[PDB]
Amino acid sequence: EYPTVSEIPVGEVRLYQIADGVWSHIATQSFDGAVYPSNGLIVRDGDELLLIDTAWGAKNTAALLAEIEKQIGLPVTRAVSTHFHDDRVGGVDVLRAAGVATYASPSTRRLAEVEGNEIPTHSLEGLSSSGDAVRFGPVELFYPGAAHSTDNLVVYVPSASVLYGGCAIHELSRTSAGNVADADLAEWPTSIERIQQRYPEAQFVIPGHGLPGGLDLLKHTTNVVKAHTNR
Ligand SMILES: C[C@H](CS)C(=O)N1CCC[C@H]1C(=O)O
Numbered sequence: 001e002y003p004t005v006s007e008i009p010v011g012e013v014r015l016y017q018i019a020d021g022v023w024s025h026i027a028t029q030s031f032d033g034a035v036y037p038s039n040g041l042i043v044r045d046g047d048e049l050l051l052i053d054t055a056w057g058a059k060n061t062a063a064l065l066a067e068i069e070k071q072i073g074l075p076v077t078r079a080v081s082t083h084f085h086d087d088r089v090g091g092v093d094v095l096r097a098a099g100v101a102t103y104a105s106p107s108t109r110r111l112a113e114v115e116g117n118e119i120p121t122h123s124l125e126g127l128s129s130s131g132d133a134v135r136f137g138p139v140e141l142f143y144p145g146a147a148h149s150t151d152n153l154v155v156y157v158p159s160a161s162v163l164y165g166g167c168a169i170h171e172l173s174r175t176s177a178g179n180v181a182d183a184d185l186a187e188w189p190t191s192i193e194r195i196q197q198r199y200p201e202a203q204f205v206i207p208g209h210g211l212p213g214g215l216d217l218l219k220h221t222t223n224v225v226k227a228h229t230n231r
């Protein structure tokens with residue numbers, strides 16, 4: 001059921017309903033001779049929508065907004081970027097031009113600025129220390145500690161038991177640790193443990209790339225990170 005990278009041409013975006021009021025959005029890009037998918041989240045926030053992450057680039061994010069308009073028809077009023085990479089903030093300017101209030105932690109904003117990436121407008125306080133959690137409407141934002149990046153946030157939708165791990169959590173078919181250029185390999189397993197400890201009731205786990213699964217994705221991620229660490 002879940003759209004794979006072979007089913008979405010670069011430039012198009014698919015929506016996938018995970019639970020009532022919760023969708024992932026799936027987009028693709030070519031990189032270094034392969035095509036990769038990328039997921040974000042959409043969470044119904046009363047009569048508005050909360051967007052988690054861009055669709056990885058301006059063109060995809062424009063397509064995302066058009067697809068949300070077509071398929072859901074509620075306004076995207078806020079967006080949270082869960083780390084500073086282009087699959088999370090690339091397209092912030094498109095969101096901003098569309099009247100979406102864009103948010104990220106100060107750690108993400110600082111790192112995005114260093115990288116020369118797009119910078120969400122608003123700063124999310126209360127997430128600077130590993131284990132910090134803040135409510136953001138229909139989701140909880142959780143900073144589990146450094147993992148895939150030092151700023152990576154995870155997002156939990158308590159009404160749907162959906163845990164969005166972002167790029168700190170790998171899909172089952174991923175055997176490498178992904179892009180580790182900005183990762184904290186030493187802390188990544190401990191950060192995963194914090195996610196497991198805070199959301200042991202999670203029923204759906206959404207990685208930043210690839211197929212959703214369950215909490216098994218967390219142990220899988222730990223195994224993959226350990227294997228990469230021991231290369
Ligand atoms: C843009 C994302 C951010 S997690 C990324 O690093 N990717 C996605 C494609 C592969 C890998 C890379 O560029 O090395």
Ligand SMILES: [Mg+2]
Nearest residue numbers: 172220221223
């Ligand atoms: Mg595994």
Ligand SMILES: [Zn+2]
Nearest residue numbers: 083085148167
């Ligand atoms: Zn990343």
Ligand SMILES: [Zn+2]
Nearest residue numbers: 087167208209
């Ligand atoms: Zn990513």
